[PDB]
């Protein structure tokens with residue numbers, strides 16, 4: 157029971173990824189933009205065929221165009237090439253043949269990182285916050301090694317499992333993320349790994365403000381003019397200068413002066429180690 161666009165595209169059966177439609181029972185909605193719904197999957201680990209699993213399933217709406225289908229097909233194929241990693245949301249399967257296009261991934265029980273942090277504000281220990289930042293750094297390092305540029309790294313686009321494992325995702329634009337973007341991305345529309353490093357800096361600031369909104373008070377129209385005078389966000393409350401140093405390094409105007417994701421993984425591991433020692 158597929159749409160007119162999907163029948164026209166006539167996608168092939170990928171034997172590594174095609175999962176049976178009848179072994180998937182849809183449940184509660186998780187997110188909207190397409191839409192994400194929670195589902196029960198049976199035999200998603202094919203060695204254990206009768207074993208039940210909770211998954212997340214992305215799909216188009218009834219009022220979706222052919223361009224929206226092409227984007228979801230484009231999203232499907234990008235996720236195949238990236239590969240399995242601890243800190244990327246794992247593709248589990250797809251449904252393409254006998255109905256609407258479904259893109260299946262693992263369900264992160266605690267939701268997105270922004271709502272995770274905001275929900276646990278005081279009326280989250282320091283090692284947990286450093287672990288979050290470190291894990292996102294490791295995910296982005298993996299992305300870069302796969303020659304993959306995210307373009308919209310933010311707390312909303314990181315998912316959190318039951319065990320507080322960070323899973324990098326992309327849900328598209330929210331219902332333009334100006335406050336997360338490097339100058340070259342905002343102004344010249346040039347996206348690189350180093351432009352993702354800028355956004356990681358803004359994500360770090362989100363984590364240690366417990367899901368705070370960046371540049372509070374300053375409207376988006378006045379932001380870019382303020383950036384090229386050299387102004388940046390101040391050190392947030394209860395944040396050491398070592399972590400603030402990494403943020404300011406991420407916000408260097410020149411991309412080459414910003415740290416690499418390899419360097420960010422190394423620096424954050426030292427902070428994780430320092431907070432665990434005693």
Ligand SMILES: Cc1ccc(C(=O)Nc2ccc(CN3CCN(C)CC3)c(C(F)(F)F)c2)cc1C#Cc1cnc2cccnn12
Pocket residue numbers: 186187192212213214231234235238244245259260261262263264265267268299304305306307315324325326327
């Ligand atoms: C069903 C579903 C389908 C797809 C994706 C998804 O994020 N796909 C994705 C597409 C592209 C990219 C990388 N590109 C970015 C653009 N860029 C230009 C090129 C590189 C990546 C990334 F992880 F690599 F970033 C992921 C997530 C879900 C989810 C879910 C889920 C699970 N639990 C919960 C709980 C609450 C809400 N949602 N949810």
